[PDB]
Design a protein around this nucleic acid. Sequence first.
DNA 1: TGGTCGGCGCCCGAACAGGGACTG
DNA 2: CAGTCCCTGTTCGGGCGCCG
Lengths: 554, 413
Amino acid sequence: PISPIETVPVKLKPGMDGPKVKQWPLTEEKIKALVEICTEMEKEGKISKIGPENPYNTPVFAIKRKDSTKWRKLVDFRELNKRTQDFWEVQLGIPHPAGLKKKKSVTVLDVGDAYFSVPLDEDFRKYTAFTIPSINNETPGIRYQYNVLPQGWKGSPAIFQSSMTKILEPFKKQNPDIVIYQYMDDLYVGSDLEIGQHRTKIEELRQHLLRWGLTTPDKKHQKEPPFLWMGYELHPDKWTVQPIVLPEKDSWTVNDICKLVGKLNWASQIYPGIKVRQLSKLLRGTKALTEVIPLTEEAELELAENREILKEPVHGVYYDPSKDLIAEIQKQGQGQWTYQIYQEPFKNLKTGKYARMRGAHTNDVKQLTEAVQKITTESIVIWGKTPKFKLPIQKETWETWWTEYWQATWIPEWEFVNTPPLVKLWYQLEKEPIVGAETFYVDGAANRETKLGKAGYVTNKGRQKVVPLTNTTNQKTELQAIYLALQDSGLEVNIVTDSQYALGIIQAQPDKSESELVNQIIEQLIKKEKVYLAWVPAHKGIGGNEQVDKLVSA
Amino acid sequence: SPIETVPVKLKPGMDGPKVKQWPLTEEKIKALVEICTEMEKEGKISKIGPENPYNTPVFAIKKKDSTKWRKLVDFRELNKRTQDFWEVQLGIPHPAGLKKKKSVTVLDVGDAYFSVPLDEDFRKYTAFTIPSINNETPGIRYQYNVLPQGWKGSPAIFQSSMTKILEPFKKQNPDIVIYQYMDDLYVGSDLEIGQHRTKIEELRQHLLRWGLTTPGYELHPDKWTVQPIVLPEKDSWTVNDIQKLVGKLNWASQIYPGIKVRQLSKLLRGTKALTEVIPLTEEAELELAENREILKEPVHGVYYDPSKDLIAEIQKQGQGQWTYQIYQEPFKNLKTGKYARMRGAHTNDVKQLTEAVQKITTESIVIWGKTPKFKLPIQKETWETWWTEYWQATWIPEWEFVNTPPLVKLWYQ
DNA sequence: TGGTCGGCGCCCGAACAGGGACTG
DNA sequence: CAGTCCCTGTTCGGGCGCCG
Ligand SMILES: Nc1ncnc2c1ncn2[C@H]1C[C@H](O)[C@@H](COP(=O)(O)OP(=O)(O)OP(=O)(O)O)O1
Ligand SMILES: [Mg+2]
Ligand SMILES: [Mg+2]
């Protein structure tokens, strides 16, 4: 029935009143069910009728469920919520099979009519006012109000969750040895007792709950391995995501692409190496989620590729704390990366990806460390431990990039894994002028309101060049210029600048940028076997400096 | 029951701290909880629900090889919102005399605050949420009934009864300067390590039998000179070797409006080869021994204006090479310094950058009576990932993240 | 016909934010 | 001094996915 648990205190937003929106007509179908529910609901005291003394009202509707004769009754509390005080959500994250420890005995329970078992506070009840229409569109609707957490109220969640934890508080306290993964009203009891004694504790827990008003109907996974839990399938020694069907279609709308990426993103936790870049890319031109969008080659493939991976069944294992937690990662190219965590080779716990290109001027070692974090954070969220690593980047390419970078980048205990495509800095930058090397003096500029500008260089061995740039900017110049001082130079060069914009960009040895021009500088940079690049103040009349200004300042 | 829970309020038009709690460790949660367990059993904290929309991040850090964890909270976002109850109403008189102390000793004692019932109508902000591994259970919340360590008013309100607990040893030894910051207390004197140390141990028998309790430890920040902006010391100069010490002194100039440019700006006026050696004249050679004196002469324009926030900047150089930019305004470097990994087990970037954010602040608090606003060189993700690992500062300095090319690091190199 | 809530993730767009460089 | 651009980051909201 309805629970004796302590009700929860909720007020409204300072100086704000209740909802007063009408009920937008519903099918002759839903009404039929709403009237079939409230009948019982009110009969069970979950809702009390009301009369004229209740000034407020908000709409409601119904929903069918996964192969269920049952309907879910919802209330469009959008307004109320706005006017309702706000709580601190207690649901921090989500449990993950891979974080489950192997247990001798498992059970799964789903509290019945969950919300409707938790009492809404006596004072607030007044706003949950609603109206259930008539079919003959004659008799004025019947009105009621909830006496239990309403389905769709901004607060129900954190309250239920909270209410629940307190209800189990005593059992867990007197049964420290039974793990109980709880999510909303979904209970997963893990025990290390024998079927005998476990099934016995499982009843205790059940009765306890019912005694507190929480019914645990037979929709309780028993000797049900495989258990269905949080969208997975829990087997004695492995687990797997439930049938995850992708949409086979011809012409693709935008949300369609959205459903794909979402799902594949769901897949990406166990089927390894799903890739999405070229499909997400396919969604930059923000438009109508009913608007037909074309499919690209890079996309078309990325689709079918993954679509294949999803054919071969895959699965993951559980966690063993008495054994190191490993994670390895590999490059999938073009800024994407895939990875998995295991403890026993080939029997991994979870898989994943990292396709976020943080920045406009970074390289792989930046994007690799960018991923090592993703994995640690996440990893701690799941095992509250941080994995040892196996990385496709030479034990030195690192002792280089870090002792050489200006920022304090760090990577945990890690080993090397010779498994191409390895990750290595595509080139270096001489930190000492190159003797017997044509010393260029580069620079340029363009004009504010006017169209063009320009840039050029000058050698110490005598050589002059400059080019007429169009639509460029203070930056699109300095760089556009250092681009030629490479092709127009050999294995060994020596460029200098009074700018820092282009100095730092090339000071990170970036090998990937959003600006094609930049890639062109790197591209060339890789080709030369020695290149130095120092800096000297601008417009402070320095040797070989001024000449360049003028040659371009025009 | 005549007690006195001092009433307090947040600034005008300022909600409370609503900051999401972040991932912890098995070891960290196991203690962080084992703590709050006792802490509730002794009414310092009390479980609370969802209906309290206020939250502050929390965590723990074992310390000093007490191999005992201490609970801590990032009240930063609160202290910022907790009105000037700590500013314009109960400021702190700068005991500038601590800069001179031969040997100062720091000792956390805020552990006394938990005997000072806090305004209940205010407790609703001290709400912190503890999480669980793999999200087995939802956030276990709590509130504060007594005084929350690591808060603005937490020390301010207590200081009154504090000073009065001091009179017996603070008047029979007025020679020493005693300062209290957040939770830690500072006792700077001049005595030798044989004596001076044996006394801090007396100030214990005084404070433990007066309530309070507490489980190289000393400091002499002034006993360490800020390394000036040193220049190169060669006997042959190349085209770049010159253009470099040139562009360096071009910026190391706004720190000294009086620093010579032209004599070394003259050595080049044509597109010359970087390798090429071209030593100098006697004027530009006297400029090397001249603009080399301005670098032993303390900068001028440095006024410690308590009206503004102490800012700082840091630099990654090489082998535990980090440098102090403690300043309140552009080029107005109140004091600068460094920090090198000691001759011990060589640690990593972040591990140190953190001590090198803690060390630099330990002083900022003694030499000024407050904390900086660090402009950090690391990446957000990175910092936030491991920073909590290597920290024993019972407080948390405000901070930001910043990436900017070097050659500006040279000037401190 | 359609429509609710909270948690987390991914991606995208927009609105900020701070430097550096120039113009008035 | 300002008022500006360039540029680089951040933050935030939105949609879809998964769970209840
Ligand atoms: N679509 C939804 N909208 C709002 N709340 C939901 C939704 N789905 C689930 N909830 C919340 C409210 C529910 O009371 C609670 C549990 O739902 P659920 O366990 O799936 O069925 P139920 O506990 O309401 O009755 P039953 O045991 O017959 O399935 O979770
Ligand atoms: Mg249910
Ligand atoms: Mg220039």
